[PDB]
């Protein structure tokens, strides 16, 4: 019964400046846990569908960096302990979205980036030719 | 059957033709004015209601990163152009 | 006496008009706050200040109505006047989002609820609470002492004048989410269960009472046992 | 014989937690990591700084909540947020836990220049996985 | 309050090397070309040789930041093999595990 009656909505102002056009957004997430990337993939893909963004997903090959350390504090060279860091990848490839839609979607999925997961988002912007290049001065 | 807003006024003052049309932008912040502005921030002072309001508060205070992430946030190289 | 004080103030205001000084919200709010002493004598003069604000163009804030509410809410029979002052104040404030303009803006809701309990009007209390829930008006409730007083008078009026099926929905929505109840509201709740002939809930009220710090209240345990037996 | 992080067998009377009972080779197999951040991922920077901060926070919390920690800390970093999740006992009064939470969150936020939050879970006693 | 006197000497070497980096870079640029006269480069040789010995960056040693061990250090974490393993084996280094393959 104790429900709000009216809710103040954040102010979104439509500008007079034209919006940016992104041909592609390549969201590459990196993590140590495949299951965490599976859950993030599900969240990010479901978020794109609700917002009407076209999204494709694939899994780039994982990278395992291994290195060797001495096991003993002193001598015993032939006895080593080997360690590794596993970096797993998921790539969300979004297409044909405006700059305003990219700001909302990236903010929404970047704020919800799980602990231990990094993101490299490569944005491909569409631009027209500069006016000086349209015709030769010579 | 009579509303309170209908009746006798005091009539000492008169209707403002318009609100002040040109503000004193460079008015100094006296201690009396700075302190009164703190009494107006205490009337809407309430504890955080949920985790979203804590992020909003940290974002306004500057503690929390602004999203989407910009690796150059807060770093303009003195407004220098590429040709410099 | 009021007449002497009311003649000096009108002289300051006329002086303020001679010196080409325009009054602000705090000018009128100070008059209403200072007339609290005179009570009945200042009731109509106080309403003359409010009507002047509207004409001049100054907008009454939550404090402007808090001061008028406190001035009219003198000990006595509120039905004669206080009834139609609060009903008109809420029709004006209906569906209005408020911004902080006066330091006393965080006292209106506590004052307005205090009269709804006195008048025993539950429809008015829902309108007062409805105003608190519109937009960001919930931030004007006040400090913790004012928050607990507001919800105590609000819930104690629900248990009294509301159906028990709705009362138990507010009991779940408010406690402990909004405030922790005083032992006298646990009692007011039991008296509501009795009037509704729903005593299968008494063992739950005792379980909740312990979870709210009322394990060792004498007035409460006696109340629970007497109803049960 | 290997020694690293191995609670050795006793006479069946030494209570160990789930973390203490698992040697290093079970890390990533049966037990997770006590800190999660991006510094150790391929192509990421500042692993050295994140590691020093973690060592300090573990010592800081050990001495700030003396006798109260019932397990190792879980350190989470998201963006510039730092979350410290600790399992504590129910011996200290609640007032002292609120004082220390307010104090620690404030002091650590000014020390490392980031918003720091402390999440406390209380248990009546140290959770025992097995008796070695 | 550094681990030992040897770590304290490296701290000072890193501080002095940082303070003289720009000056040494500029003088070295004069010595590292075949464009300027030898008479000018011979003077630049003497100028960089007269700078404080602890301004020279080759004297900086990558010691373990927690134990000051001068060898067996992993650059990425700036820890000795012993200290790194202690943290790694207790699951305190994010994403690091024992490697079997
Ligand atoms: Mg061996
Ligand atoms: Mg060397």
From Swiss-Prot, chain A:
Compartment list: Mitochondrion
Cellular component, GO annotation: mitochondrial inner membrane; mitochondrial matrix; mitochondrial small ribosomal subunit; mitochondrion
UniProt KW Ribonucleoprotein keyword: yes
GO BP: mitochondrial translation
Main localization of the protein described in the UniProt heading: mitochondrion
Domain of life of the native organism: Eukaryota
UniProt name for this protein: Small ribosomal subunit protein uS10m
From Swiss-Prot, chain B:
Gene expressing this chain: MRPS31
Quaternary state and interactors: Component of the mitochondrial small ribosomal subunit (mt-SSU). Mature mammalian 55S mitochondrial ribosomes consist of a small (28S) and a large (39S) subunit. The 28S small subunit contains a 12S ribosomal RNA (12S mt-rRNA) and 30 different proteins. The 39S large subunit contains a 16S rRNA (16S mt-rRNA), a copy of mitochondrial valine transfer RNA (mt-tRNA(Val)), which plays an integral structural role, and 52 different proteins.
Native source organism of the sequence: Homo sapiens (Human)
Subcellular location: Mitochondrion
Superkingdom of origin organism: Eukaryota
Name the record gives this protein: Small ribosomal subunit protein mS31
UniProt record similarity statement: Belongs to the mitochondrion-specific ribosomal protein mS31 family.
Curated annotation (Swiss-Prot), chain C:
Molecular function via GO: ribosomal small subunit binding; RNA binding; rRNA binding
Gene behind the chain: PTCD3
UniProt disease link: Combined oxidative phosphorylation deficiency 51: An autosomal recessive, mitochondrial disorder characterized by intrauterine growth retardation, low birth weight, poor overall growth, progressive limb rigidity, delayed psychomotor development, hearing loss, and optic atrophy. Brain imaging shows abnormal bilateral signs at the basal ganglia and brainstem. Patient cells show decreased mitochondrial complex I and IV levels and activities, and generalized mitochondrial translation defects.
Entry comment describing in which tissues the protein is expressed: Abundant in testes, skeletal muscle and heart tissue.
Protein name: Small ribosomal subunit protein mS39
Single GO BP term: mitochondrial translation
Keyword Ribonucleoprotein found: yes
Described purpose of this protein according to its UniProt entry: Mitochondrial RNA-binding protein that has a role in mitochondrial translation.
PPR repeats: 24-60, 61-102, 105-139, 147-181, 182-216
Compartments, as annotated in UniProt: Mitochondrion
Keyword Magnesium (UniProt): no
Membership in a protein family: Belongs to the mitochondrion-specific ribosomal protein mS39 family.
UniProt keyword annotations, A-Z: Acetylation, Mitochondrion, Primary mitochondrial disease, Repeat, Ribonucleoprotein, Ribosomal protein, RNA-binding, rRNA-binding, Transit peptide, Translation regulation
Main subcellular location of this protein, as a coarse class: mitochondrion
Gene Ontology cellular component terms for the protein in this record: cytosol; mitochondrial inner membrane; mitochondrial matrix; mitochondrial small ribosomal subunit; mitochondrion; nucleoplasm; plasma membrane
From Swiss-Prot, chain D:
Biological process according to GO: mitochondrial translation
Keywords from the named record: Mitochondrion, Ribonucleoprotein, Ribosomal protein, Transit peptide
Subcellular location: Mitochondrion
GO cellular component terms, semicolon-separated: mitochondrial inner membrane; mitochondrial small ribosomal subunit; mitochondrion
Signal peptide location: none
GO MF annotation list: RNA binding; structural constituent of ribosome
Family to which the UniProt record says this protein belongs: Belongs to the universal ribosomal protein uS3 family.
Binding partners and assembly: Component of the mitochondrial small ribosomal subunit (mt-SSU). Mature mammalian 55S mitochondrial ribosomes consist of a small (28S) and a large (39S) subunit. The 28S small subunit contains a 12S ribosomal RNA (12S mt-rRNA) and 30 different proteins. The 39S large subunit contains a 16S rRNA (16S mt-rRNA), a copy of mitochondrial valine transfer RNA (mt-tRNA(Val)), which plays an integral structural role, and 52 different proteins.
Name listed for the protein in its UniProt record: Small ribosomal subunit protein uS3m
Gene label: MRPS24
Full-protein residues shown: 36 to 167 of 167
């Amino acid at each position: 019964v104790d429900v709000p009656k009216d809710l103040t909505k954040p102010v979104v102002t439509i500008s007079d400046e034209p919006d940016i056009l992104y041909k592609r957004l390549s969201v590459l997430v990196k993590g140590h846990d495949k299951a965490v990337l599976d859950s993030y993939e599900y969240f990010a893909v479901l978020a794109a569908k609700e917002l009407g963004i076209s999204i494709k997903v694939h899994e780039p090959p994982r990278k395992i960096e291994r290195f060797t350390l001495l096991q003993s504090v002193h001598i015993y060279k032939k006895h080593r302990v080997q360690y590794e860091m596993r970096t797993l990848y998921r790539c969300l490839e979004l297409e044909h979205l405006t700059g305003s839609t990219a700001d909302v979607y990236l903010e929404y999925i970047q704020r919800n980036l799980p602990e231990g997961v990094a993101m490299e988002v490569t944005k491909t912007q569409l631009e027209q030719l500069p006016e000086h290049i349209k015709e030769p001065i010579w | 059957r009579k509303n309170i807003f209908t009746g006798k006024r005091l009539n000492i003052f008169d209707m403002m033709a318009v609100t002040k049309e040109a503000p004193e932008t460079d008015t100094s912040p006296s201690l009396w004015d700075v302190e009164f502005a703190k009494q107006l921030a205490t009337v809407n002072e309430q504890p955080l209601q949920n985790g979203f309001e804590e992020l909003i508060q940290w974002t306004k205070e500057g503690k929390l990163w602004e999203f989407p992430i910009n690796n150059e946030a807060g770093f303009d190289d003195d407004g220098s152009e590429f040709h410099e | 006496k009021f007449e002497e004080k009311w003649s000096k103030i009108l002289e300051l205001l006329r002086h303020m008009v001679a010196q080409k000084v325009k009054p602000n919200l705090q000018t009128f709010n100070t008059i209403l706050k200072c007339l609290r002493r005179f009570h009945v004598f200042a009731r109509s003069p106080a309403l003359q200040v409010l009507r002047e604000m509207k004409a001049i163009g100054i907008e009454p804030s939550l404090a402007t109505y808090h001061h008028i509410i406190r001035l009219f809410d003198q000990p006595g029979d509120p039905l004669k006047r206080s009834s139609f002052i609060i009903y008109d104040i809420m029709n004006e404030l209906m569906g209005k989002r408020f911004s902080p303009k006066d330091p006393d803006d965080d006292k209106f809701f506590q004052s307005a609820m205090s009269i709804c309990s006195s008048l025993r009007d539950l429809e008015l209390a829902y309108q007062v609470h409805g105003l608190l829930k519109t937009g960001d008006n919930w931030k004007f409730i006040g400090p913790d002492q004012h928050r607990n007083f507001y919800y105590s008078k609000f819930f104690d009026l629900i248990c009294l004048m509301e159906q028990i099926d709705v009362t138990l929905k507010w009991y779940e929505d408010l406690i402990p989410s909004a405030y922790f109840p005083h032992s006298q509201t646990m009692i007011h709740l039991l008296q509501a269960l009795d009037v509704a002939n729903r005593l299968e809930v008494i063992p739950k009220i005792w379980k909740d009472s312990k979870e709210y710090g009322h394990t060792f209240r004498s007035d409460l345990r006696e109340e629970i046992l007497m109803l049960m037996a | 014989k290997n020694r690293a992080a191995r609670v050795r067998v006793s006479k069946g009377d030494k209570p160990v937690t789930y973390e203490e009972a698992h040697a290093p080779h079970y890390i990533a197999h049966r037990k997770g990591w006590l800190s999660l951040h991006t510094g150790n991922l391929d192509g990421e920077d500042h692993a050295a700084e994140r590691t020093v901060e973690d060592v300090f926070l573990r010592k800081f919390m050990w001495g700030t909540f003396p006798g109260c920690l019932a397990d190792q800390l879980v350190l989470k970093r998201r963006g510039n947020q730092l979350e410290i999740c600790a399992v504590v006992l129910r011996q200290l009064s609640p007032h002292k836990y609120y004082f220390l939470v307010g104090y620690s969150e404030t002091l650590l936020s000014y020390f490392y220049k980031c918003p720091v939050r402390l999440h406390l879970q209380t248990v009546p006693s140290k959770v025992v996985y097995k008796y070695l | 309050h550094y681990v030992d006197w040897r770590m304290w000497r490296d701290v000072k070497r890193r501080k002095m090397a940082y303070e003289y980096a720009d000056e040494r870079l500029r003088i070295n640029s004069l010595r590292k070309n075949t464009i300027l006269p030898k008479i000018l480069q011979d003077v630049a040789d003497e100028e960089i040789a007269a700078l404080p010995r602890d301004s020279c960056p080759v004297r900086i040693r990558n010691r373990c930041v927690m134990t000051s061990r001068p060898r067996g250090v992993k650059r990425r974490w700036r820890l000795s093999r012993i200290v790194f393993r202690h943290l790694a084996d207790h699951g305190q280094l994010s994403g690091i595990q024992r490697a079997t393959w």
